[PDB]
Design a binder for this molecule. Structure first.
Ligand code: AGS
Ligand code: AGS
Ligand code: AGS
Ligand code: AGS
Ligand code: ADP
Ligand code: MG
Ligand code: MG
Ligand code: MG
Lengths: 325, 474, 318, 339, 332
């Protein structure tokens, strides 16, 4: 129906959560054993933390899931007061229930303040007997050690290609779509372990098609829908810097940046990534290139004039790769 | 397009991680050289003193009994005592005298002084009746005006040596303690008993009360007492308890507690129990510190460059925290001031987020918040490693400050303005309009040149009083 | 159902079981034995045993009167101006008959989260009713408590637990729990604890529950942090290409953020011993520069690559 | 009091040097309906603030010189008493970013909001270069949102650290330094109003060449030399330079002659004495570098190394908190190079 | 009131009237006649016709009287991501469509959804990954949020997923010159040959900067009262560009090589008031573009100029930085 593919292709059970396997196996062992300690699912966004907790909560709590599970979000307009109010009201009510272990899913807890995190730790300690928390976050360095020590941390890694491609195959056949192998490879390498990005780009590619029935999606379609540098453009810029004149290198760099709307930071990162694949005769080449490009990126972040920064990029690459020759 | 880069491809070798337990044993933390907690002797309790086996706190066990034991200069003691006696005698007669004392300053005995004066005046503890209005209660008009008016209007049921003391008159809530200064004014109009006000700062007190008190010479400043007298009092107190202690540790206790008799007495109440455990490190000793010459200038050049880079790192990362620290609710933030400005809120809502009344706006940056103790701080590690082997780094850490070199700038500008005004107002505004850097670099040094030139001709014998500016730069 | 965690199952119920800070713990034991407990502000890092110390001291001081003689106020409970002016004052004014020398204890745990006005109102309350009740704070940061409150209490600064005390209590727990231990595994537990004793107990429990025998590899499987040996190999490799490959594969592709990589690199380098002290401090300076650049906002892969390049230059040359 | 204050042009017509800029400002004040946001930049002591004040007077009136001092106290996260002298007027307001350090964003936005709470009020901002990037972004937001009631006139010695949008939405006005003849003319006017007995007019030219295009420095040197010799300037009368400049010259001499660690300790003590007298470290480094570059026992390579280390340590000074470390590192690197 | 800046006085009011940019205006008129747009993003040089195009789309979509109520430009401004942006967005969701006008019926489809404009809201202290996602889902039928961006460096794929990314192409010099000449003709701006090309050269394609510079030059010319055609020197002075004669003297001095001569020239040049950053930029233009210099020299001077510019941006003394840069270029 008229819904995004993100919600349509949500993992309705723990068997549909691909990529993350250690976490799913541990969670299944937890539910089979019955020991469900306080959980902290953290990692890069789109890894499948909310999907995992929703699937587990449904699997344990059947039909009563609606009343036995409260899904919070600290980023909303509540603050420490209303957030604490809701948690204590849900945890201390002991409503008429079939069993127990009311679950509270607090999403976006890295935005919770230090006092709020300490209060949440105290509330978790007080109501452990009847309420189990599965605090969710994206970065573990924004969480206080008090909250980090009262929950069983479960890091989520970016999904491996073997999985992303499996979900590609699953969504493609059901939605009647064709992905050319180069386009599929581009999408897999551009998602960077983000299944949500995959679904959004796939839906946009479906909408882009003049006839979304049998038209195959090409590489350029994905690289322009996501808004990312094509490998050909970065490679052309790199080869123009490496083997052409200063004026021609400047012309190619400016033309590519203007035509593709590409900032210099993305160009530097893509050039570094491409040059990683290639081998260099000398080592001072790599050392000087990495150091100079990092300095250029740091200066770009602070501010300046882009012409001198682009000239510095070209000169740094040229000097580094004339060191090897 | 292929646009192949003129570089051969690299075949990445396959990385494997099989770590022997011998490599795991290398993870043991090397013994830190920066850490150096040096212990002191255990306290030697002599005899069986009755004061040692007490049930009251040591700050209250050594409560002053006369006006000689309070840690306040005798001149101000006599002034306050005479003022209280004169107020008692004057208010006894039917009544130009408004009973009001502002006992401001940063001293400690700002409340026991009044109690000791009452004890001396009355001669007995039961005779005097001091009604202390502390911050632990609601000091609002509709909660205390009637009570204070009745107390200061009629006689206590029992010479009526009655007094009202307003402890901590500086910390006042906006909504909880509503109409407090109106209560003070109304009491001053219709009182027959003295009214003592104590604060740590005089800014919060309204200027009307300040002027009224200054007219009657009833504005007394409590200056902090030097650490020598505090140390002597502590030594005498410990002699009364008959407790031996090395004088170095007692000096450290006096120094680290900011010469606070109550804080020092609590610290001694803890750290002087009959146990064999060694004492607190107090002033940490040098971590085998050797502030050597460093031999070649290359080594000291590297050390100074590392120090400069570390200072840059500290300035860049000591105020950028990753955890969103909260803003205190009971602070005068501009949002709180504008929130109470809006009249849509009723009394009950204003009770929830009542703020302490202050004269300084509490601004804060939600992004540039100070680092939490558990967050990574490499600057501290570099500083503690460099200080452990070079003393001049630790000296440089406190040779200059932020409050210092700014108060010095203020005093230098004041001296410059005085010398300029002493010419044989317009400067006060226009030179202030001139940028601070300009005054620092050009105006003040040249004013010093003129001052030394005019001091030279005065010794030989267009401006007067040049010695102040001469002394400021020296 | 649930199994009691070793953090809670093996929590010290007496003050003697608490390890670390021997002088302060002994003095607290003497206070609990005799009485006349002064106002204290126990402060320090998380997990060193502050709240446990306060609760054990209160229990030993009171006994059967703990229920009606101790009022605990954490951050979950309300500690506003109204609470301080009514509940704490009424508890202080309460008439409870206790053995001589003993006093009621007002445990205000996490006092660093309390508002300033509540702290100001608490000052007169503790100064007036100090002959019947005694207050006890417990804060992670001691500077968040106002100077008027700190001038009426004996500030206690608990220090980080050393490796010896953590090893001793861990050996005790392993001995009463029948846990198969290896020297490398216990060393890994101490290394990952970093003075946080609760973290050490939790890591031991997780390792035993998951992989049985406590080897160092098993400990470094349940910490979800960059492997210290992998990071050491990345930093100390003589070939920059190998270090770059390690950073790309084992750290960046596995989801380790730049902050965790920088923290692990700094900790490993600080614990490194084969390199000279000057080289150690210079590599630490490079890591600090990289951490600064990350904090400014530039936490990309290229900054970590440049950090590795500078460390490689420093190691191979000079 | 000082001749740098009493003989300050208080009108657009009173402005003597840079007649083109005077005509431009007079034409700008000819229609007071619209003042574009002005960014007056140039060397120090060139009459930028004097011209801003004269323009504000010409639009409003002689009141723009009746200044009152409103002291504002602020508290940050670490509880520091941030105290500011906010020079105000019935028609204009004046602020200075450096006097509030890193936190120059919240204070600036609070003061500008307070101004906008009440044709237009012009706010003068001294040393806009010292503003942090976030504060400059806040100013950029203010210039567009609060354009109807607030007109920001910013005076900075260098416009390079200013962001691009601020320059794009401002009228860039450049103030070149006065020539030696113009400084001599101003000094001669001050003389003939103060009755200074010169033996010749060469003394004024010497003062102008010593001040290096700084009117304030030249006027202060005139006042000092006049009061020293009792209004009797002579050819033998030496130019009065401030004590810190002489101390910097002695420090450079010591650095050149003595290259040792103990010499570096003595240099650190000298730097501490200089910084304790409330002298900014940027000027100290500038004078130290330009006095080391003028030493006649040094070749080209050493001086190039001096300028390189000076640039590096100036960049570190702009991004550092403790200045003594940067200055001592510069001195140590200089001494290592001079070996 | 009577006076109006020419940047907004000549803003294109009709969507199709937007100069060049056919790839955008055609698809945008199709989406306007579709009676509903998805939340769209545009990228290009700041001042290439982003705000003008979105306001013109709203102009041909809603009514002029309906405009100031339906559109709230809660852009990167005083409005804060959630402190105000989200609060005002939800309070506007509490508000419905105002009275329908006359010409608005049938002529102006006036779709119920509202349009919220946020120019470069990515440069904000609030990172709303889903704080506005929820508010455009709960209020999709009653409002839409349009965003402005510079490059394709989009921050969060949520809240930026269903985006018709329009590439506002760089405005060609011919059409920009035509537009500026048209504005000059309307405002009777007397200009000789070379003013408009120079204005476009310093503004580097930024018509907003170009229009503001032209307005400032016209105001200065009226201030002088000569009535003569504006010269390129006045435009250069109104933008901060160092005159080419000074730059040629600088390059001659650094070709001379003497440290003392360079130091004296820099000392005499710091008194002129010309900024060091403009000197660095014009030295870059003179050196990197020139074909009379070796590749090694340009490679070294690129890093030298980059370091000098980076240090100058951090608020350091211009005298020391320019002296060091010129000396280092001399040693090259
Ligand atoms: N391991 C996975 N297996 C299957 N689908 C997945 C997996 N990870 C993510 N997805 C899909 O990608 C989207 C991610 O949804 P969520 O789990 O809610 O996002 P998240 O992982 O919790 O991260 P956020 O951004 O903090 S909500 C959904 O459409 C899922 O169906
Ligand atoms: N010699 C002494 N002189 C004064 N006070 C003493 C002395 N010895 C001990 N004290 C204690 O010092 C304290 C001073 O009185 P307090 O009322 O607690 O302080 P205060 O007057 O309220 O001023 P503060 O705490 O700075 S607001 C009392 O607790 C006294 O018991
Ligand atoms: N020195 C110690 N000896 C024995 N057990 C300890 C020690 N320190 C900590 N623990 C244990 O580790 C846990 C620490 O609990 P708490 O004392 O409440 O932590 P904390 O010191 O208050 O720090 P917080 O909770 O982050 S404010 C308890 O389960 C204790 O049993
Ligand atoms: N295609 C165009 N046709 C005519 N005038 C234009 C065109 N593009 C820009 N302008 C002029 O430049 C001004 C700014 O254009 P816009 O790009 O729409 O505004 P803007 O996006 O806010 O600029 P920025 O990004 O804030 S610098 C307009 O008001 C016009 O005066
Ligand atoms: N046109 C002028 N004629 C005479 N004196 C001037 C003129 N412009 C500036 N001055 C002198 O400059 C001094 C003020 O300099 P100021 O504008 O504060 O320098 P800056 O702009 O660097 O802050 C005054 O004392 C005044 O005598
Ligand atoms: Mg989620
Ligand atoms: Mg605790
Ligand atoms: Mg815009």
């Amino acid at each position: 129906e008229n819904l995004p593919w993100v919600e349509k292709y949500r993992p309705e059970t723990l068997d549909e959560v691909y990529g993350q396997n250690e976490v799913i196996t541990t969670v299944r062992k937890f539910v089979d054993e019955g020991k469900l300690p306080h959980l902290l699912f953290y990692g890069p966004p789109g890894t499948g933390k909310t999907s995992t907790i929703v699937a587990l909560a449904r699997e344990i709590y059947g039909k009563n899931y609606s009343n036995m599970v409260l899904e919070l979000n600290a980023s909303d307009d509540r603050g420490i007061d209303v957030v604490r109010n809701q948690i204590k009201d849900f945890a201390s009510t002991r409503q008429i229930f079939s069993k127990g272990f009311k679950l509270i899913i607090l999403d976006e807890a890295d935005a919770m303040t230090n006092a709020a995190q300490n209060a949440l730790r105290r509330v978790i300690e007080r109501y452990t007997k009847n309420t189990r928390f599965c605090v969710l976050a994206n970065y573990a360095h924004k969480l206080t050690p008090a909250l980090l020590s009262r929950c069983t941390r479960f890091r989520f890694q970016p999904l491996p290609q073997e999985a992303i491609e499996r979900r590609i195959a699953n969504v493609l056949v059901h939605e009647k779509l064709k992905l050319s192998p180069n386009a599929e490879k581009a999408l897999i390498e551009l998602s960077n372990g983000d299944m949500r990005r995959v679904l959004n780009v796939l839906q946009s590619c479906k909408a882009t098609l003049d006839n979304p029935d049998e038209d195959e999606i090409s590489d350029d379609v994905i690289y322009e829908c996501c808004g990312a540098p094509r490998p050909s453009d970065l490679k052309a810029v790199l080869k123009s810097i490496l083997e052409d004149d200063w004026g021609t290198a400047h012309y190619t760099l400016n033309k590519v940046r203007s035509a593709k709307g590409l900032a210099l930071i993305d160009l530097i990162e893509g050039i570094v990534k491409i040059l990683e694949d290639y081998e260099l005769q000398n080592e001072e080449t790599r050392v000087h290139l990495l150091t100079k490009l990092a300095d250029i990126e740091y200066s770009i972040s602070k501010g300046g004039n882009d012409q001198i920064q682009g000239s510095a990029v070209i000169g740094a690459i040229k000097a580094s790769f004339e060191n090897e020759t | 397009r292929s646009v192949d880069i003129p570089l051969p491809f690299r075949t990445i070798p396959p990385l494997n991680h099989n770590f022997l337990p011998s490599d795991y044993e290398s993870l043991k933390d090397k013994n830190s050289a920066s850490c150096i907690p040096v212990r002191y002797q255990a306290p030697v309790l002599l005899g069986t003193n009755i004061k040692r086996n007490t049930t009251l706190t040591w700050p209250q066990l050594f409560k002053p009994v006369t006006l000689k034991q309070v840690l306040i200069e005798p001149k101000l003691k006599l002034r306050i005592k005479n003022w209280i006696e004169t107020s008692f005698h004057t208010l006894e007669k039917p009544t130009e005298f408004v009973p009001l004392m502002i006992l401001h300053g940063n001293s400690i005995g700002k409340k026991t002084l009044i109690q000791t004066i009452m004890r001396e005046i009355a001669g007995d503890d039961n005779s005097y009746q001091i009604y202390e209005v502390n911050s632990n209660m609601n000091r609002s008009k509709k909660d205390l005006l009637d009570i204070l008016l009745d107390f200061t209007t009629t006689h206590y049921v029992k010479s009526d040596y009655g007094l009202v003391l307003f402890n901590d008159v500086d910390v006042l809530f906006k909504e909880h303690d509503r109409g407090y200064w109106a209560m003070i004014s109304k009491l001053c109009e219709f009182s027959r008993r003295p009214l003592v006000l104590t604060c740590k700062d005089l800014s919060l007190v309204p200027s009307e009360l300040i002027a009224l008190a200054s007219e009657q010479n009833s504005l007394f400043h409590t200056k902090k007492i030097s650490t020598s007298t505090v140390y002597a009092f502590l030594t005498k107190y410990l002699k009364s308890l008959e407790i031996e202690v090395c004088d170095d540790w007692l000096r450290d206790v006096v120094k680290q507690n900011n010469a606070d008799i109550r804080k020092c007495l609590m610290h001694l109440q803890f750290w002087c129990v009959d146990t064999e455990a060694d004492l607190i490190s107090s002033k940490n000793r040098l971590p085998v510190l050797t502030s050597t010459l460093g031999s070649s200038v290359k080594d000291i050049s590297q050390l100074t460059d590392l120090l400069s880079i570390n200072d840059v790192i500290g300035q860049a990362t000591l105020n950028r925290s990753m955890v969103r620290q909260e803003i205190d609710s009971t602070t005068m933030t501009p949002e709180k001031v504008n929130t109470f400005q809006d009249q849509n809120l009723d009394d009950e809502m204003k009770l929830k987020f009542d703020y302490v009344i202050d004269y300084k706006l509490h601004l804060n940056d939600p992004n540039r918040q100070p680092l939490l103790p558990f967050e990574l701080n490499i600057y501290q590690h570099i500083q503690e490693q460099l200080e452990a082997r070079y003393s001049y780094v630790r000296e440089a850490n406190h040779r200059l400050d932020n409050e210092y070199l700014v108060n010095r700038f203020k005093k230098m500008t004041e001296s410059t303005l005085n010398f300029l005004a002493s010419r044989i107002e317009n400067a006060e505004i226009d030179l202030l309009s001139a940028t601070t850097q300009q005054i620092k670099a050009e105006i003040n040094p040249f004013v010093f040149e003129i001052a030394k030139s005019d001091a030279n001709v005065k010794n030989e014998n267009f401006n007067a009083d040049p010695s102040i500016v001469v002394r400021k730069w020296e | 159902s649930l199994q009691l965690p070793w953090v809670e199952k093996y929590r010290p119920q007496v003050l003697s079981d608490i390890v670390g800070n021997k002088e302060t713990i002994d003095r607290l034991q003497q206070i609990a034995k005799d009485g006349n407990m002064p106002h204290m502000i126990i402060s320090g890092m998380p997990g060193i045993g502050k709240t446990t110390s306060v609760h054990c001291l209160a229990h030993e001081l009171l006994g059967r009167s703990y229920a009606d003689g101790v009022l605990e106020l954490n951050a979950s409970d309300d500690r506003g101006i109204d609470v301080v002016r009514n509940q704490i004052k009424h508890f202080a004014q309460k008439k409870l008959h206790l053995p001589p020398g003993k006093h009621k204890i007002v445990i205000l745990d996490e006092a660093d989260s309390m508002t300033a006005g509540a702290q100001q109102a608490l000052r007169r309350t503790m100064e007036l009713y100090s002959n019947s009740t005694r207050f006890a704070f417990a804060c992670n940061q001691s500077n968040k408590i106002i100077e008027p409150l700190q001038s009426r209490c004996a500030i206690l600064r608990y220090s980080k637990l050393s490796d010896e005390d953590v090893l001793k209590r861990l050996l005790q727990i392993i001995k009463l729990e029948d846990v198969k231990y290896t020297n490398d595994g216990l060393e890994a537990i101490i290394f990952t604890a970093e003075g946080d004793m609760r973290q050490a107990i939790n890591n031991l429990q997780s390792t035993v529950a998951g992989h049985g025998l406590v080897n160092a590899d098993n400990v470094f499987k349940i910490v979800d942090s960059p492997h210290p040996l992998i990071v050491k190999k990345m930093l100390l490799a003589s070939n920059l290409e190998d270090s770059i490959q390690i950073l790309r594969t084992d750290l960046w592709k596995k989801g380790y953020s730049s902050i965790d990589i920088v923290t692990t690199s700094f900790r490993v380098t600080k614990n490194l011993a084969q390199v000279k002290e000057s080289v150690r401090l210079e590599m630490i300076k490079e890591i600090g520069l990289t951490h600064m650049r990350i904090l400014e906002g530039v936490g990309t892969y290229l900054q970590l690559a440049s950090m590795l390049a500078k460390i490689h230059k420093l190691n191979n040359k000079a | 009091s000082l001749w740098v204050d009493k003989y300050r042009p208080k009108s657009l017509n009173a402005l003597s040097h840079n007649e083109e800029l005077t005509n431009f400002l007079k034409s700008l004040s000819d229609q007071p309906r619209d003042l574009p946001h002005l960014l007056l930049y140039g060397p120090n002591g060139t009459g930028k603030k004097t011209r801003c004040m004269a323009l504000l007077e010409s639009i409003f009136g002689p009141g723009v010189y009746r200044l009152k001092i409103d002291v504002r106290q602020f508290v940050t996260a670490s509880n520091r008493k941030l105290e500011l002298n906010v020079v105000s007027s019935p028609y204009h307001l004046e602020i200075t970013p450096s006097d509030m350090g890193n936190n120059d964003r919240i204070v600036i936005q609070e003061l500008l909001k307070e101004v906008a709470q009440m044709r237009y009020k012009c706010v003068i901002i001294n040393e806009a270069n010292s503003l942090t990037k976030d504060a400059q972004a806040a100013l950029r937001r203010t210039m567009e949102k609060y354009s109807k009631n607030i007109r920001l006139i910013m005076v900075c010695d260098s416009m390079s650290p200013i962001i691009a949008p601020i320059k794009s939405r401002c009228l860039l006005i450049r103030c070149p330094a006065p020539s030696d003849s113009e400084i001599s003319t101003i000094l001669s006017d001050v003389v003939t109003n103060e009755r200074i007995q010169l033996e010749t007019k060469d003394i004024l030219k010497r003062i102008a060449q010593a001040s290096n295009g700084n009117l304030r420095v030249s006027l202060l040197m005139l006042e000092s030399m006049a009061l020293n010799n009792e209004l009797a300037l002579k050819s033998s009368s030496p130019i009065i330079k401030p004590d810190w400049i002489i101390v910097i010259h002695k420090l450079t001499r010591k650095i050149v002659k003595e290259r040792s660690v103990n010499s570096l300790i003595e240099c650190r003590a000298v730097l501490y004495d200089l910084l304790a007298h409330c002298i900014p470290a940027n000027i100290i480094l500038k004078e130290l570098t330009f006095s080391l570059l003028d030493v006649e026992t040094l070749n080209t390579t050493n001086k190039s190394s001096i300028i390189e280390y000076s640039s590096v340590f100036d960049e570190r000074l702009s991004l550092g908190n403790k200045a003594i470390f940067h200055l001592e590192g510069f001195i140590a690197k200089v001494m290592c190079c001079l070996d | 009131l009577a006076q109006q800046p020419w940047v907004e006085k000549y803003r294109p009011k009709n969507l199709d009237e937007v100069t060049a940019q056919d790839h955008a205006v055609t698809v945008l008129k199709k989406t306007l006649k579709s009676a509903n747009l998805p939340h769209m993003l545009f990228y290009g040089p700041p001042g290439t016709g982003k705000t003008s195009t979105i306001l013109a789309l709203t102009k041909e979509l809603y009514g002029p009287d309906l405009m100031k109520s339906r559109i709230l430009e809660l852009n990167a401004s005083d409005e804060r991501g959630i402190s105000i942006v989200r609060e005002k967005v939800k309070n506007f969701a509490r508000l419905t469509v105002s009275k329908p006008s006359k010409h608005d019926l049938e002529n102006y489809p006036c779709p119920p959804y509202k349009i919220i404009i946020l120019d470069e809201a990515d440069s904000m202290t609030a990172d709303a990954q889903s704080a506005l996602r929820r508010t455009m889902e709960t209020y999709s039928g009653v409002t839409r949020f349009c965003l402005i961006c510079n490059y394709v460096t989009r921050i969060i794929d949520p809240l930026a997923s269903r985006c018709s990314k329009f590439r506002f192409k760089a405005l060609d010099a011919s059409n920009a010159i035509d537009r500026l000449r048209f504005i000059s003709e309307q405002e009777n701006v007397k200009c000789d040959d070379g003013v408009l090309e120079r204005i476009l050269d310093i503004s580097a394609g930024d018509l907003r900067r170009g229009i503001t510079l032209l307005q400032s030059a016209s105001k200065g010319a009226q201030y002088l009262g000569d009535g003569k055609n504006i010269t390129s020197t006045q435009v250069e002075e109104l933008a901060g560009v160092v005159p080419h004669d000074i730059l040629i003297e600088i390059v001659e001095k650094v070709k001379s090589g003497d440290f003392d001569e360079i130091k004296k020239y820099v000392n005499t040049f710091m008194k002129s008031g010309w900024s060091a950053a403009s000197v660095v930029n014009q030295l870059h233009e003179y050196y990197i573009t020139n074909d009379n210099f070796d590749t090694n020299f340009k490679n070294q001077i690129s890093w030298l100029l980059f370091t000098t510019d980076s240090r100058l941006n951090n608020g350091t003394n211009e005298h020391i930085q320019l002296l060091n840069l010129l000396v280092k270029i001399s040693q090259l």
